[PDB]
């Protein structure tokens, strides 16, 4: 049994049939040790007496909030959550396994530049009694730098039968001295609590690997007098990190085989939808969304 928040404890137990429960002793957050009594959830029934309450925890029926009383009015409480270890592995019921990259990819990440700001997002079919918490850091070093906001709702992409719900979070690394290269992976830790069930997820990554740039800025044309050679030029996205020379980009110019990749910020094609993506010059990160234009 360990402590999550103050007055919130998690106990872990394995699901092999002939396995025991845990004998936990609940102490009351009080000075006086006289006539107090215990209760569970919303029931009024006394479980026992004493500043201390020894119990066994074997099932979700033993979880929930134990409250000690005295003189009718409430004294303090102890919530208990269960972390379920099925057989070596821990439970992963609440977050869906979007087996896109490798497998067991429960929480995903993207960054629109090399600033340190990134956004993570997980998926879940559950829609009630949910409570998350995100923490992060690069390496065992500086516990600070990386700070995270609050997980929020973001989508509702309904699917056959059960409806899907997407949650996202925003994070910001802030190194007292920025490095020219990442030697250790950024690490994300999500605590997921669904009713009485506790679980925690983790993902490690390099920013250099989870980069998606905003689409190319603004495009133009130039057929000139009467010759029909559609000339296309754009500009580096506003969010992209600067100096654009130290942080080169690359592009893919498409249309409606014939695909043309290029580095420079301008090119010309042949006339007949038009569009152009953008990718980190150095690494095979993610292509940006498309930017269309008339034929």
């Amino acid at each position: 049994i360990w402590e999550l928040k103050k007055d919130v404890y998690v106990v872990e137990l394995d699901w092999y049939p002939d396995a025991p429960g845990e004998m936990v002793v609940l102490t009351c957050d009080t000075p006086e040790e006289d006539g107090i009594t215990w209760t569970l959830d919303q029931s009024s029934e006394v479980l026992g007496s004493g500043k201390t309450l020894t119990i066994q925890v074997k099932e979700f029926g033993d979880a929930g909030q134990y409250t000690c009383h005295k003189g009718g009015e409430v004294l303090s409480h102890s919530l208990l959550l269960l972390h379920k270890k099925e057989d070596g592995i821990w439970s992963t019921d609440i977050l869906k396994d979007q087996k896109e990259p490798k497998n067991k990819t429960f929480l995903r990440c993207e960054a629109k530049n090399y600033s340190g700001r990134f956004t993570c997002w997980w998926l879940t079919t559950i829609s009630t009694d949910l409570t998350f918490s995100v923490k992060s850091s690069r390496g065992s070093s500086d516990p600070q730098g990386v700070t995270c906001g609050a997980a929020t709702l973001s989508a509702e992409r309904v699917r056959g039968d059960n409806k899907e719900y997407e949650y996202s979070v925003e994070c910001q690394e802030d190194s007292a001295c920025p490095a020219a290269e990442e030697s250790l992976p950024i690490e994300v830790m999500v605590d997921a609590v669904h009713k009485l069930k506790y679980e925690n997820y983790t993902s490690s990554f390099f920013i250099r690997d989870i980069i998606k740039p905003d689409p190319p800025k603004n495009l133009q044309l130039k057929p000139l007098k009467n010759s029909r050679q559609v000339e296309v030029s754009w500009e580096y996205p506003d969010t992209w990190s600067t100096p654009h020379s130290y942080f080169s980009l690359t592009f893919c110019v498409q249309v409606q085989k014939d695909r043309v990749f290029t580095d420079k910020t301008s090119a010309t094609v042949i006339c007949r939808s038009i569009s152009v993506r953008a990718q980190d010059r150095y690494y095979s990160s993610s292509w940006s969304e498309w930017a269309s234009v008339p034929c």
Partner: antibody
Framework: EVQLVQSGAEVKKPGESLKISCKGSGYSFTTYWLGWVRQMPGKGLDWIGIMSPVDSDIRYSPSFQGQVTMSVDKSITTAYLQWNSLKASDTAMYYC????????????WGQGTLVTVSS | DIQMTQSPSSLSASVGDRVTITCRASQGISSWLAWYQQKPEKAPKSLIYAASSLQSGVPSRFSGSGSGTDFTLTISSLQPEDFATYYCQQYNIYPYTFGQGTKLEIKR
């Protein structure tokens, strides 16, 4: 005023199915787990298993696993024990009981349901 | 399963006596033992849990002790309503199992 009130004595022939109930009241129904126990003619108590009122989290004694079926319609606060094919050996008294939380034993007991299986 | 073994299978005592049933487990069950009392056609009443703790409601005259493997039950000063058979139960490892009972017949 905790009360587990079970359905009346039943009598059946081997191979018939049967579902017995136990309505609870006087207590917060969704806080306490419910369990069943058998007691054969002049014998001791067989722990059949245990289960939750809210979610379908059941715990059958390996001996009764797949022999019987536990359920609970929380809207009417009633637990159910069920057979699909009764044997003579099944005839006994069937108690339903309430599992005291943070311990695991039985807080309170039903008054029993006499079940007779004979040809 | 964990074998619960009560003894004596039966005994006889008078009103006002100090009596003690014992119970023992085939394994270790910590202090996770409960005691029940049953009468002829009646259902069982829940008396003691956690080996030594009285369920809210039961008389002072009852009590239990023991931990791990050998547990008991004692009535300091016996009384009429206390005549019945008594069962112990292990609630440590599934399945929870009972003793075969201990009848208390009157001594006459």
């Amino acid at each position: 005023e905790v009360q587990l009130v079970q359905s009346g004595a039943e009598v059946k022939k081997p191979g018939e199915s049967l579902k017995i109930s136990c309505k609870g009241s006087g207590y917060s129904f969704t806080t306490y787990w419910l369990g069943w126990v058998r007691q054969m003619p002049g014998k001791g108590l067989d722990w059949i298993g245990i289960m939750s009122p809210v979610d379908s989290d059941i715990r059958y004694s390996p001996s009764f696993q797949g022999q019987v079926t536990m359920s609970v319609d929380k809207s009417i606060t009633t637990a159910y024990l069920q057979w699909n094919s009764l044997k003579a050996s099944d005839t006994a008294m069937y108690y339903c009981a309430r599992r005291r939380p943070g311990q695991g034993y039985f807080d309170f007991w039903g008054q029993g349901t006499l079940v007779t299986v004979s040809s | 399963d964990i074998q619960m073994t009560q003894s004596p299978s039966s005994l006889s005592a008078s009103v006002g006596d100090r009596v003690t049933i014992t119970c023992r487990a085939s394994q270790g069950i910590s202090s996770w033992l409960a005691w029940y009392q049953q009468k002829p056609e009646k259902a069982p009443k829940s008396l003691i849990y956690a080996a030594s703790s009285l369920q809210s409601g039961v008389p002072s005259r009852f009590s239990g002790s023991g931990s791990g493997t050998d547990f008991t039950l004692t009535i300091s000063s016996l009384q009429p309503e206390d005549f019945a058979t008594y069962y112990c139960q292990q609630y440590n490892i599934y399945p929870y199992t009972f003793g075969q009972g201990t009848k208390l017949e009157i001594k006459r």
